[PDB]
């Protein structure tokens, strides 16, 4: 898929894109505005042009693949450095 994760085919593009971690409401709407799709369309009914548009937009922007690692790195850092905040994190 666009971000390597399947999206609902029977839903609007706006909310279909939200199922990707890191890409929420504002990010999805901004990507749709950049792509020029009007935000009212089915994802099962699209063409290669606007598909590749969103694909390259996502590849240029941040993705779950990077966020999953960045958040984990930050968490491990703030846990290892002491950081009573990090202590609470480890405690859960």
């Amino acid at each position: 898929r666009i971000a390597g994760v399947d999206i609902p085919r029977d839903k609007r593009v706006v909310i279909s894109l939200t199922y990707i971690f890191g890409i929420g409401r504002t990010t999805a709407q901004q990507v749709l505005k950049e792509a020029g799709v009007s935000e009212d369309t089915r994802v099962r009914d699209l063409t290669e042009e606007e598909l590749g548009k969103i694909r390259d937009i996502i590849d240029k922007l941040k993705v779950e693949g990077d966020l999953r690692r960045e958040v984990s790195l930050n968490i491990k850092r703030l846990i290892e450095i002491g950081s009573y905040r990090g202590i609470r994190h480890r405690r859960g």
Partner: protein
Amino acid sequence: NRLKEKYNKEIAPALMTKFNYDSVMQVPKIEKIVINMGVGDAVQNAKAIDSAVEELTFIAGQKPVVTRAKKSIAGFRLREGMPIGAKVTLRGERMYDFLDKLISVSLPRVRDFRGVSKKSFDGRGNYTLGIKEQLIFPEIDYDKVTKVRGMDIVIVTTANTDEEARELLTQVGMPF
């Protein structure tokens, strides 16, 4: 083809000259690739045995075997002769096509693929995996995919040492 000529013309001569073998066919060769499914979850889902059998036929036309328990176990609620997992042996153009498909789609399709395990060399010269996702490459029909458990793949080579097997795999394109 697209792999046999590449091998015979780049991997064999280069590796032979690199390792200073005393004969032409002394170069290590990939004998076969065995794919296994491992599951005894069939105990709780008798139809689970059907799963990964229709998927394996699409992954490779070679129909898998319904391997059966060679020994019973109470901890797993097992009895000798009950079906557990599936087996497939690719030898010939099938293994070449499987390697091509894998390298071209499966590894690049994985979301978080980076620096595959270096550990999973046998010591002996074989290389061993358990893909944990059942929808790695396109022939698995994401829509029809219901269960998510991937496949064991076992690469077997005539290499006498792990070092030469590593070199062969890297020259073939294994992104270590």
